[PDB]
Amino acid sequence: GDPPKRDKAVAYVYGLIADPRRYDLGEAGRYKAEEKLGIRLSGRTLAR
Amino acid sequence: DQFRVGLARLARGVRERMLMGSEDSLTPAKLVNSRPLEAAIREFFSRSQ
């Protein structure tokens, strides 16, 4: 229903999984993800 | 965590006040309304289970 504006969609998706002010895996969450997945995370969010 | 929530309210109010008023008369002290911060801390320390 919401109009599919490019910037509005960008802001919504950025806030959902990519905004450090909204999405936050803790330091413990970062450590758990790194040890389970065997990767190195740049930050505490799902995407950059 | 409660402090962070209060700071989020403070920042939201600060942005609201920034998008208003003569930009020449705007000072750091004038933009910040601290009341939600006390609201959050006091609610945590008086009402949290």
């Binding site: 969450g29 758990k32 | 910040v32």
Partner: protein, 48 residues
């Protein structure tokens, strides 16, 4: 500090943000004259 993006006019100020309750030497708080304890919370850790 209040900073203009182009002008560079710097306005520095110390702001009173309020009061933070202080933990006593034994580890408790005095809220409205009553002794209180904050109980630690166990929950599921963030991660994958």
């Amino acid at each position: 500090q209040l900073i203009h993006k182009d002008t560079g006019l710097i306005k520095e100020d110390e702001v009173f943000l309020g009061h933070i309750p202080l933990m006593t030497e034994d580890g408790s708080f005095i809220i409205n004259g009553a002794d209180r304890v904050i109980v630690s919370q166990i929950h599921r850790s963030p991660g994958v």
